[PDB]
Amino acid sequence: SRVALVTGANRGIGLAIARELCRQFSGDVVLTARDVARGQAAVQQLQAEGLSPRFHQLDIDDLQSIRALRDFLRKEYGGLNVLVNNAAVAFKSDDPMPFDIKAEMTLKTNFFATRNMCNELLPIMKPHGRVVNISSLQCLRAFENCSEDLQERFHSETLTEGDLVDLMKKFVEDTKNEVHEREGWPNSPYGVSKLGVTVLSRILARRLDEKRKADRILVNACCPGPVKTDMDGKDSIRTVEEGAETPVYLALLPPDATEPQGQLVHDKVVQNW
């Protein structure tokens, strides 16, 4: 009857979150991935541990994919109890691309797709459900690197979803027109995308409080914390599993909790910016 779901869950922190929900969540866990071969291999890996996740395909950049997942969840469970929006991209210099494309493709997944996930799936969230949007502490650095005018816009409690969408869209356009510095933006498309995820989280919490406060749904943004690099350049496995701690905490907040709501959370603590 109850069901939790994780996006981008075939490797990294998303896989660690899917594992921990299998251990800690009272209900089914749906591991999702855009690459079905990768997703099913991850499911088999957790099965080899003795766990029982379910699989569903999900590419958050594909609206038909989001809606197929939505339909599956309504049919099988009558909705959703826990949503962890973990899927993200960050393009390094080994993936050479012009800056305006880097900006466009980073915001496409991290912000616009995450937003589409929230809008398609929030209506099917059950009472006392939780939404966890994986952001990054880089979003703070990005905020600090905005002009004062932009900071005031992102910081304001009255900012609407539409205002936010338009600002994110503006970043991308400004990069296409080669004016993003003049316009007060920082240089990190990843940081800007995560700022968007953070602010979207505040907005979705206001919206839930407005339209359905008695459902007691909690939406928070989450920084899984600095991860540490190993000798071979990879994220060390322990710190990757440690990275699941705050997301899982936020996913499993007891039914009576009224806080954190719409907050940015790192190591179980609210980040004030």
Q: Which residues bind ligand NAP (CB under 6 A)?
A: 7-8, 10-14, 33-35, 38, 58-61, 86-89, 109, 113, 134, 136, 223-224, 227, 235
Residue 64: exposure state from Cβ atoms within 10 A (0-12, 13-18, ≥19): exposed
Specify binding-site residues for substrate.
136
Q: Which is nearer to ligand NAP, 175 or 246 (CB)?
A: 246
Shortest CB 31 distance to ligand NAP, Å: 10
Reply yes or no on whether 77 is catalytic. no
Q: Which is nearer to ligand NAP, 107 or 134 (CB)?
A: 134
Q: Which two tokens stand for residue 111?
A: 């912000």
**Contact (CB, 8 A) for 150 and 185:** yes
CA 202 – CA 199 distance, rounded (Å): 5
Shortest CB 72 distance to ligand NAP, Å: 15
**Contact (CB, 8 A) for 138 and 190:** yes
Residue 250: exposure state from Cβ atoms within 10 A (0-12, 13-18, ≥19): buried
Q: Which is nearer to ligand NAP, 60 or 131 (CB)?
A: 60
Specify binding-site residues.
6-30, 34-38, 59-60, 86, 136, 190-194, 235
Report helix, strand or coil for 215: helix
What contacts 96, CB < 8 A, 6 or more positions away?
none
Give me the catalytic one of 190, 208, 219, 253.
190
CA dihedral 213, 268, 19, 8 (to 10 degrees): 70
What contacts 6, CB < 8 A, 6 or more positions away?
14, 17, 18, 21, 29, 30, 31, 32, 84, 86
Shortest CB 61 distance to ligand NAP, Å: 4
**Contact (CB, 8 A) for 111 and 196:** yes
Task: Give the DSSP H or E segment for 174.
Answer: helix 161-176
Shortest CB 155 distance to ligand NAP, Å: 21
Q: Which is nearer to ligand NAP, 35 or 71 (CB)?
A: 35
Shortest CB 59 distance to ligand NAP, Å: 4
Query: Closest by alpha carbon to 32, among 200, 3, 23?
Result: 3
Q: Which is nearer to ligand NAP, 9 or 253 (CB)?
A: 9
Please list the active-site residues.
190
